[PDB]
Symmetry: C2
Subunit: 184 residues, 2 copies
């Protein structure tokens, strides 16, 4: 109901996150910075991961535009490139850190799976489902696996390999996920 | 030269890693546990990440067998499944933790990239190069990108999604990376 209160709590959580890192954030510290009580915070968020996640999503331009180019390929290309561009952004670099912490904190992982990753994957599903009903995609396509083929390499590059995640790489990745490695 | 000394240092580093986690390991602690001097350790390893990485690789069955089924598909299937099976193993679960820490410690990331990930990717390259000279793969195949299509989804599942990484998933993943999502 109170948008100013919600804003203060969310700004405080993100400020603390950037200043000190995830592990050091506590609900008490957020309450202190936001000048609200813990009970108020617990009106809207049960735990520190939930509030920090909403703080991040509030502060960053994480919501991707929805292409409708009439082409599954060119739709996914724009989607994946816009995702990759977010991830390399200063704001997007928080994702590394959160996923890193999430290897040790399943509460945080639950939060990013439902609040960050699910909505973006949903968008990708919507573009693929256009392609299916357009009759341009595989017979009995496994949508979720197909999204794994595009997203997987993206996040693998971001988290593991440390290689350059640029438009040209993402272009090649999308095409090759569409063509497959088998000779045609 | 001294295999017993090397063994003691490597066992100590892995013991400390399992007991206390990566961040708490120090070269001093390894020296203490192994009953050797820091100077001895620094005969073979400059830093804690290097020694902990070799400790891990020494203790775990991380070296994958090399299929030669005369089929790029069935070769990669066996490779990727054996990798996935390692990753879900008790020993393999250390990879999550190391990559997690590696988001904050580039020294560790350098170590796992060259000592763990590179050799496995090399093996995958060798299987794909058989397929290319067999004339069963794509015209002008980008080998490294192709490995990204298989490995990426694997590590994405392991690190981000928390979904079940089983033989059947890996099977579907490999086939779909071979077929592509575009209608044939």
């Amino acid at each position: 109901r109170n948008i100013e209160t919600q804003k203060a709590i969310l700004s405080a959580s993100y400020e603390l996150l950037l200043e000190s890192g995830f592990k050091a954030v506590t609900v008490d510290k957020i309450a202190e910075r936001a000048k609200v009580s813990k009970a108020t915070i617990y009106k809207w968020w049960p735990n520190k991961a939930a509030v920090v996640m909403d703080g991040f999503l509030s502060a960053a331009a994480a919501r991707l535009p929805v292409p409708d180019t009439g082409s599954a390929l060119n739709d996914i290309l724009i989607h994946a490139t816009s995702l990759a561009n977010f991830l390399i952004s200063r704001e997007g670099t928080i994702i590394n850190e959160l996923v890193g912490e999430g290897q040790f904190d399943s509460k945080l992982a639950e939060e990013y799976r439902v609040r960050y990753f699910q909505p973006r994957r949903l968008q990708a599903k919507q573009l693929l489902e256009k392609g299916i009903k357009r009759g341009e995609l595989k017979e009995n396509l496994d949508i979720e696996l197909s999204i794994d083929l595009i997203y997987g390499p993206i996040f693998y590059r971001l988290l593991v390999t440390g290689e350059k995640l640029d438009d040209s790489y993402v272009h090649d990745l999308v095409i090759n996920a569409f063509e497959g490695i088998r000779l045609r």
